[PDB]
Design a protein around this motif. Structure first.
Motif, mmCIF file in Angstrom:
data_model
loop_
_atom_site.group_PDB
_atom_site.id
_atom_site.type_symbol
_atom_site.label_atom_id
_atom_site.label_comp_id
_atom_site.label_asym_id
_atom_site.label_seq_id
_atom_site.Cartn_x
_atom_site.Cartn_y
_atom_site.Cartn_z
ATOM 1 N N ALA A 158 33.052 13.302 16.806
ATOM 2 C CA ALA A 158 34.004 14.053 15.654
ATOM 3 C C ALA A 158 35.216 14.191 16.671
ATOM 4 O O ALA A 158 35.656 15.335 17.764
ATOM 5 N N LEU A 159 35.891 14.924 15.389
ATOM 6 C CA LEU A 159 38.006 15.335 15.763
ATOM 7 C C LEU A 159 37.702 16.315 14.475
ATOM 8 O O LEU A 159 37.380 16.511 13.106
ATOM 9 N N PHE A 160 37.487 17.763 14.944
ATOM 10 C CA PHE A 160 37.614 18.592 13.779
ATOM 11 C C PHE A 160 39.598 18.883 13.336
ATOM 12 O O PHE A 160 39.775 18.616 13.904
ATOM 13 N N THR A 161 39.060 18.891 12.085
ATOM 14 C CA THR A 161 40.655 18.728 11.200
ATOM 15 C C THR A 161 40.311 19.305 10.425
ATOM 16 O O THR A 161 41.045 18.829 8.854
ATOM 17 N N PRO A 162 40.618 20.191 10.179
ATOM 18 C CA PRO A 162 40.240 21.748 9.047
ATOM 19 C C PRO A 162 41.615 21.936 8.157
ATOM 20 O O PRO A 162 42.722 21.071 8.528
ATOM 21 N N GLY A 163 41.105 22.398 7.179
ATOM 22 C CA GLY A 163 42.577 22.649 6.351
ATOM 23 C C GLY A 163 41.701 22.497 4.792
ATOM 24 O O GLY A 163 41.968 23.703 3.833
ATOM 25 N N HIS A 164 41.565 20.953 4.695
ATOM 26 C CA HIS A 164 41.041 20.935 2.910
ATOM 27 C C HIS A 164 39.734 21.496 2.828
ATOM 28 O O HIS A 164 39.880 22.091 1.730
ATOM 29 N N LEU A 165 38.521 21.823 4.118
ATOM 30 C CA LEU A 165 37.828 23.429 3.936
ATOM 31 C C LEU A 165 38.239 23.538 5.683
ATOM 32 O O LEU A 165 37.869 22.644 6.045
ATOM 33 N N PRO A 166 37.448 24.273 5.567
ATOM 34 C CA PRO A 166 37.807 25.376 7.979
ATOM 35 C C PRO A 166 36.938 24.508 8.186
ATOM 36 O O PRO A 166 37.413 24.262 9.306
ATOM 37 N N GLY A 167 36.348 23.831 7.792
ATOM 38 C CA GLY A 167 34.737 22.689 8.092
ATOM 39 C C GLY A 167 35.187 21.256 8.374
ATOM 40 O O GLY A 167 34.420 20.458 9.031
ATOM 41 N N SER A 168 36.641 21.073 7.650
ATOM 42 C CA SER A 168 36.562 19.278 7.728
ATOM 43 C C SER A 168 36.892 18.944 9.115
ATOM 44 O O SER A 168 37.353 19.074 10.074
ATOM 45 N N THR A 169 35.942 17.741 9.332
ATOM 46 C CA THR A 169 35.550 16.717 10.438
ATOM 47 C C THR A 169 36.093 15.649 10.130
ATOM 48 O O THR A 169 35.532 14.887 8.690
ATOM 49 N N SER A 170 36.374 14.829 10.467
ATOM 50 C CA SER A 170 36.871 13.630 11.064
ATOM 51 C C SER A 170 36.190 12.961 12.347
ATOM 52 O O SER A 170 35.922 13.475 12.956
ATOM 53 N N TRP A 171 35.836 11.318 12.289
ATOM 54 C CA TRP A 171 35.453 10.778 12.883
ATOM 55 C C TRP A 171 35.939 9.830 13.952
ATOM 56 O O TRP A 171 35.876 8.963 12.907
ATOM 57 N N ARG A 172 35.564 9.596 14.538
ATOM 58 C CA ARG A 172 36.247 8.271 15.253
ATOM 59 C C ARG A 172 35.242 7.339 15.807
ATOM 60 O O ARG A 172 34.229 8.074 16.928
ATOM 61 N N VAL A 173 35.245 5.868 15.988
ATOM 62 C CA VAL A 173 34.413 5.499 16.074
ATOM 63 C C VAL A 173 34.690 3.856 16.921
ATOM 64 O O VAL A 173 35.965 3.708 16.594
ATOM 65 N N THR A 174 34.269 4.246 18.040
ATOM 66 C CA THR A 174 34.360 2.756 18.717
ATOM 67 C C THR A 174 33.301 1.726 18.571
ATOM 68 O O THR A 174 31.884 2.120 19.268
ATOM 69 N N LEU A 175 33.294 1.035 18.324
ATOM 70 C CA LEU A 175 31.840 0.294 17.962
ATOM 71 C C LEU A 175 31.938 -1.180 18.729
ATOM 72 O O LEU A 175 32.417 -1.361 20.179
ATOM 73 N N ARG A 176 30.500 -1.653 18.466
ATOM 74 C CA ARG A 176 30.408 -2.706 19.246
ATOM 75 C C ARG A 176 31.299 -4.195 19.816
ATOM 76 O O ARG A 176 31.188 -4.197 20.881
#
Length: 270
Positions: A158-176
């Motif tokens: 989880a990367l908290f990226t607030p602004g659009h909403l207070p709780g806006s969350t972006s997600w970084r994924v490392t794949l197999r």
């Protein structure tokens, strides 16, 4: 902040617009272990692993049968989903969470503000109020900034990226397969009610820190919560014409951040 009714609200979009965005498209594989199961413009991403799956975002509640059928059309099963992830708690990303969680038994994962708003069925939105409610749902796992979930050989952070909403969350994924992916939440902010918003007094500084957080993420694959933020449809046609690299876009996220920053600036100037 608690909602202050003396604070002006933004007008809610018409439901017809969300329905236009909710127009279905056939699922497809972005890369190994990454399936697009969303709609024409409302993203939903299925991350498949030998230990079960993670689904990011759910679309409208009206779309919940369609997303399940999309997962099944790709050959996977909703009962194999271990985690549901939310970017932000509005109806076009979380409307279907209640039913998807019911149908799958998965744990819903979200930041505390998204959890609060999903538990309210979308009500008390800092910008929309109660205009666009959806089925209330309880979050099982509160996620924190830079906190990771591991499952079947992938890592989701989880990367908290607030602004659009207070709780806006972006997600970084490392794949197999060693490739890295970002699922960026919206960086869009409301006209006029940006500054001195009693319902969300940290909006202006939040969104600026979110620009920096996302600009610092150098990934292989750029996905976003809305299709026209990451070139979904034109990439899908490049893909379905023989370009298996269509969605590999190492500079796409940085460009989206820059486009969002420029828009925010014209909004502050107005």
């Amino acid at each position: 902040a608690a909602l202050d009714p003396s604070q002006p609200l933004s007008p809610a979009p018409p439901l017809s617009l969300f329905k236009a965005w909710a127009k279905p498209i056939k699922p497809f594989q972005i890369t190994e272990g990454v399936w697009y199961v969303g709609t024409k413009n409302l993203s939903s991403i299925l991350l498949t692993t030998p230990a079960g799956h993670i689904l990011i975002d759910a679309g409208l509640d009206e779309s919940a049968p369609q997303i399940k059928a999309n997962i099944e059309a790709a050959g996977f099963r909703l009962t194999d989903v271990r985690y549901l992830l939310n970017s932000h708690a509005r109806l076009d990303q979380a409307g279907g969470m209640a039913r998807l969680k019911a149908w799958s038994g998965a744990q819903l994962v979200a930041s505390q503000p998204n959890a609060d708003q999903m538990a309210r069925g979308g009500r008390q939105d800092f910008a929309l109020g109660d205009a666009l409610p959806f089925p209330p749902v309880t979050t099982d796992k509160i996620i924190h900034h830079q906190e990771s979930i591991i499952l079947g050989g992938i890592t989701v952070t989880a990367l908290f990226t607030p602004g659009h909403l207070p709780g806006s969350t972006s997600w970084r994924v490392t794949l197999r397969n060693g490739k890295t992916l970002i699922y960026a939440d919206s960086l869009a902010t409301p006209d006029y009610l940006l500054i001195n918003n009693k319902n969300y007094p940290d909006l202006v500084t939040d969104i600026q820190s979110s620009f920096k957080t996302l600009a610092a993420q150098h990934v292989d694959i750029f996905i976003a919560n809305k299709g026209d933020h990451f070139g979904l449809l034109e990439k899908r046609q490049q893909l379905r014409n023989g370009d298996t690299q269509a969605f590999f876009d190492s500079n796409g996220l940085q460009q989206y951040v820059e486009r969002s920053r420029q828009r925010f600036i014209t909004q502050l100037t107005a």
